[PDB]
Design an enzyme around this catalytic site. Structure first.
Site, mmCIF file in Angstrom:
data_model
loop_
_atom_site.group_PDB
_atom_site.id
_atom_site.type_symbol
_atom_site.label_atom_id
_atom_site.label_comp_id
_atom_site.label_asym_id
_atom_site.label_seq_id
_atom_site.Cartn_x
_atom_site.Cartn_y
_atom_site.Cartn_z
ATOM 1 N N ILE A 191 0.846 -1.199 0.000
ATOM 2 C CA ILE A 191 0.000 0.000 0.000
ATOM 3 C C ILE A 191 0.882 1.250 0.000
ATOM 4 C CG2 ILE A 191 -1.775 1.348 1.263
ATOM 5 C CD1 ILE A 191 -2.909 -1.348 2.328
ATOM 6 N N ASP A 228 10.078 2.365 7.214
ATOM 7 C CA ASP A 228 9.781 1.013 7.622
ATOM 8 C C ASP A 228 10.847 0.523 8.562
ATOM 9 O OD1 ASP A 228 9.224 -2.066 7.231
ATOM 10 O OD2 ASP A 228 7.679 -1.129 6.048
ATOM 11 N N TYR A 232 12.778 6.593 13.282
ATOM 12 C CA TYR A 232 11.454 7.163 13.624
ATOM 13 C C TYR A 232 11.501 8.709 13.704
ATOM 14 C CZ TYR A 232 8.557 3.102 14.698
ATOM 15 O OH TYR A 232 7.777 1.971 14.614
ATOM 16 N N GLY A 265 2.019 -2.913 10.684
ATOM 17 C CA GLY A 265 1.291 -3.835 11.571
ATOM 18 C C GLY A 265 1.353 -5.243 11.093
ATOM 19 N N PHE A 266 1.185 -6.204 12.000
ATOM 20 C CA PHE A 266 1.115 -7.588 11.578
ATOM 21 C C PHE A 266 -0.239 -7.904 10.941
ATOM 22 C CE2 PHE A 266 4.762 -9.039 13.998
ATOM 23 C CZ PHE A 266 4.843 -8.075 14.991
ATOM 24 N N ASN A 325 -5.378 -2.764 10.287
ATOM 25 C CA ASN A 325 -6.620 -3.387 10.669
ATOM 26 C C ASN A 325 -6.539 -4.084 12.019
ATOM 27 O OD1 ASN A 325 -8.924 -2.707 8.987
ATOM 28 N ND2 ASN A 325 -7.590 -3.438 7.319
ATOM 29 N N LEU A 346 -9.005 4.908 7.561
ATOM 30 C CA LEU A 346 -9.518 4.472 6.242
ATOM 31 C C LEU A 346 -10.674 3.446 6.482
ATOM 32 C CD1 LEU A 346 -9.400 4.172 3.204
ATOM 33 C CD2 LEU A 346 -7.830 2.154 3.557
ATOM 34 N N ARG A 374 -16.094 0.209 -3.960
ATOM 35 C CA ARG A 374 -16.479 -1.058 -4.508
ATOM 36 C C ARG A 374 -17.964 -1.081 -4.870
ATOM 37 N NH1 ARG A 374 -12.689 -3.343 -0.230
ATOM 38 N NH2 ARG A 374 -10.741 -3.594 -1.369
ATOM 39 N N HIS A 380 -15.114 -0.569 9.290
ATOM 40 C CA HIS A 380 -14.484 -1.126 8.108
ATOM 41 C C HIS A 380 -14.116 -2.592 8.352
ATOM 42 C CE1 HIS A 380 -11.981 -1.319 4.542
ATOM 43 N NE2 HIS A 380 -10.848 -1.405 5.222
#
Lengths: 311, 311, 311, 311
Positions: B14, B34, B66, B80-81, B117, B140, B148, B172
């Site tokens: 993304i 990252d 950072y 995130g995982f 998420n 988001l 969609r 979401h």
């Protein structure tokens, strides 16, 4: 395919802005046609240099020769007298007839956008004399009138202008039918914003009146509307050229919608590669239909006066 | 003002698309951050060359530090995982906490967009640990889910995708609340198109289910969603950066709307120069509210699991 | 940062096109200022509606009040009499002086673009009376004159207009210095195309003369140049606003370049967030320098006449 | 004309970015073709939703069926093995042969862009087996390699990236010929900037080496080049589709230029509606020609190895 050829029949102020925007958007080669000697060559030259600033490569040519309609993909008609007003109707009929004969001969497969006022009359006269199919000719009206309504509401509500959606139907001019029930803000019914006291009914009435009267407001401020008309027309043209299939309110031949046939009037249509791909009929209530009927009646009254001079 | 500084916290797929689109749109300088060594430098280098093709002049830099959050105007968090799923919630909480501390220290006036998420949980955790004002952080959700729904309807109806407007609220993920009553096509209520048999209720049910399940459909086709997420995020960011004041559905702190407080959930908001400038509360009926309540309940259930590991 | 505020001091034809393009490009809020009552309000209203068609959200306001310069980021000056020509120089000096006093008071940190002819004179007068730093004021000239040269060559060679690069220096007007040696096509020296007989020296001479005389050619065709001027000015403004750092030829204070100080003249500069970030001095040969000297001399002659009326 | 149909033969990382940019730019309908089952459907679905955010209306479809080449206007070939390297040449020859047979059958009037490395070999093999005219097929090389050189110089000089113009010819890969003499900054010879000590010869040597080695630099940073390749390819495609007639350096059939025939190599060409409309031969000196000759020789060496497997 080579580039589209776009012929602007009339190179006055609206023509000039249209030429400018076509180059900005790299939409096609442009011909600025006018009956006035040399002026369109001069505007075309000025406009052509902007290819450099825009990183575009559209030719911009002037013309004083109707035959330069040959091979046009899109023909935009602004030509006509503008200065009572009904006395101009037969003069402008003659202009539509002449242009129509040249379109029939030189570019019968062109998509045609009519601007000459009163547009809902003039478009049908050009349809009849050009011989083009009903899905290949439209008149400017609702994109322009709704841009005003949308814009004024958006300023009140402090939202992006395009996020206000609204419908104005029937005719382009003083009998336009502004449909309060079909206004949304970010897709949400306007009524919700009225319920929350974010905009009142009284404010909306003022905005409606301002919408109907916007051309007069601008003229009374010692300017004249041509920039928004041009942009509206170019939005329509671009939808056709690029097959975007936008829903845009335009003057189109009615074949029973709203109870009306054999006349042009303003209604949402879908514009794509096949021209008018869909005519959308809003499911008006009786009060809204009555107003639609008044708009049509006025188009018919003026159409009747267009046919003939009297001594 | 110098250009905006946009820090992408997470330089995975993304992130890569986001960097690409920022340069295309010349929106600001980009930092691809990252924790993975060197990879973000490599993507940043590749991406930087596209300034030439795009006629832009955005710097694109990688970072493994950072502190490079210093001076960020916009921070977009994808880190995130992603690989049951609830077991990741406390790991991802720790990631939000760490990022929040760095935002508080280095860019407390940044506008923050959370993607990790489940976003409606993660956004609130980052809000709490970053200390930023409620109008300066969003998640988001609705721009992506509605893209969609809008797209599928537009293909059925053969209209421009953007001319379909729709609302998906609450959260979401699988409890998203798809509001049939708030769908329009060219500003016209969807119901009119159903009445005309242009699209049926049964077709719409199928499109709703497809909308909810789109991420799974893509994964089952051996791809994964990242291009549309990126575009949605960039639409949000751009609205902020350019003060467009678009109405966009995003996860935002609720302060009584829909009967809910002290939680984030999806609702139309207006995004401009002052961040979340308006939170729009749709006037839901009881059946729609019940679904909104189920979405919130699920966000709360997962938030509770996020706080703590257990042995 | 809120949006940029862009004040157009003069709302005539060039102003109108500038307003149009700012909205198309969503570059900032626009104020159309003029001394003519109401006209700028009328143009501003017309122009404002195009936010809808453009998916932009720039305010466009008219003004008859100099104080509306407050907070301007960019000020573009087109105001001045245009109808011998040297007799206008002291009238136009007075206009620069008045505008300069208002800039000093209300927006001393604005970036200023001067258009009033003769621009290389008028720009320096406005510099002196506005008090702005030398890196914060420039005059339109080379972007416009070179757009013509580039365009004409590109049409001969059948290449994209922007792929022709060329330099015209010294002054904007009949003493402009067209530098054959600095023309390239897709980055390749023009001479290679002459060597291959793709374009001849004689053709180039004709194109040079046409370039110098383009404004006269357009006026003789019963049009007038304003669309390309507007686009050129907007390219300059945009480079500043967006920190693009484009190399653009503009009238700027010379501090020894080409042997000249204490005067403005046309030379490539780099325009970014800090205004005139670099002044590039082309390494002219003696024949080219002689022409540069004639351009400067003519700017000085007219500057001397600008100071004072005589009875 | 309906929209262009653009078939991406290979739906890997470069394909994905290409699909993304086509939708952003509304350039045509896209088919993501690959031999891998379902993956291109998944990417196509994800990509299709971005029509909403982009206000575009391009279809994006996946395909596992070569017959979907029917009616393609533009075919972009990225398919091929990438993991010594010369051992892949006959495998990749077989891929070109198979694709060529399908182009000959299904879309013989398509414009074809080849990406599979080594591109100057692979393009000629696809030319031979597809049967398309020499003006209808090209290879990616110089737009990509020069984007790096231009970008690095622009960062040193603090100018807009696109304002640096440069030529890299002969072949795409380690024998690329970087032509110092053909570098300009804002149209001005690079040498002037070296003379002024704004950039040194030693810095330039370092930038040349970095240019040649950029793909390796990115891979060594644990990323891989695909974003800039995609953008370069889309610039080429767009020039064709929109008849922009940009001068772009691409691999094209040589017919005597530089002393070479019966081989493809990198040289500026003009790309418009008729494909390769012009092949521009730079007037190289003997030292530059010698390097051009080494590039060709290496293309020939690899072409010879491409024909046949050995036991």
């Amino acid at each position: 395919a080579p580039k589209a050829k776009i012929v602007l029949v009339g190179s006055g102020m609206i023509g000039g802005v249209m030429a400018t925007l076509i180059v900005q958007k790299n939409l096609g080669d442009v011909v600025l046609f006018d009956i006035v000697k040399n002026m369109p060559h001069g505007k075309a030259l000025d406009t052509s240099h902007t290819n450099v600033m825009a990183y575009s490569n559209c030719k911009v040519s002037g013309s004083n020769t109707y035959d330069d309609l040959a091979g046009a993909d899109v023909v935009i008609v602004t030509a006509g007298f503008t200065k009572n007003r009904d006395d101009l109707l037969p003069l402008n009929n003659k202009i539509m007839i002449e242009i129509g004969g040249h379109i029939k001969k030189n570019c019968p497969n062109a998509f045609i956008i009519v601007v000459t006022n009163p547009v809902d009359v003039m478009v049908q006269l050009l349809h009849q004399h050009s011989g083009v199919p009903k899905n290949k000719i439209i008149g400017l009206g609702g994109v322009l009138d709704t841009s005003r309504l949308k814009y004024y509401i958006s300023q009140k509500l402090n939202v992006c202008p395009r996020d206000v959606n609204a419908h104005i139907v029937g005719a382009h001019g003083n009998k336009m039918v502004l449909l309060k029930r079909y206004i949304t803000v970010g897709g949400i019914p306007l009524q919700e914003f009225i319920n929350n006291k974010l905009i009142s009914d009284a404010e909306l009435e003022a905005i409606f009146d301002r919408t109907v009267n916007t051309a007069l407001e601008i003229v009374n401020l010692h300017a004249s509307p041509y920039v928004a008309p041009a942009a509206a027309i170019i939005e329509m043209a671009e939808s056709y050229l690029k097959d975007l299939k936008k829903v845009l309110i335009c003057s189109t031949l009615l074949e029973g919608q709203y109870g009306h046939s054999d006349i042009f009037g303003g209604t949402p249509v879908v514009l794509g590669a096949n021209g008018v791909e869909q005519v959308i009929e809003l499911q008006l209530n009786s009060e809204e239909k009555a107003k639609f009927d008044e708009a049509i009646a006025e188009t018919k009254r003026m159409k009747a006066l267009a046919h003939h001079h009297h001594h």
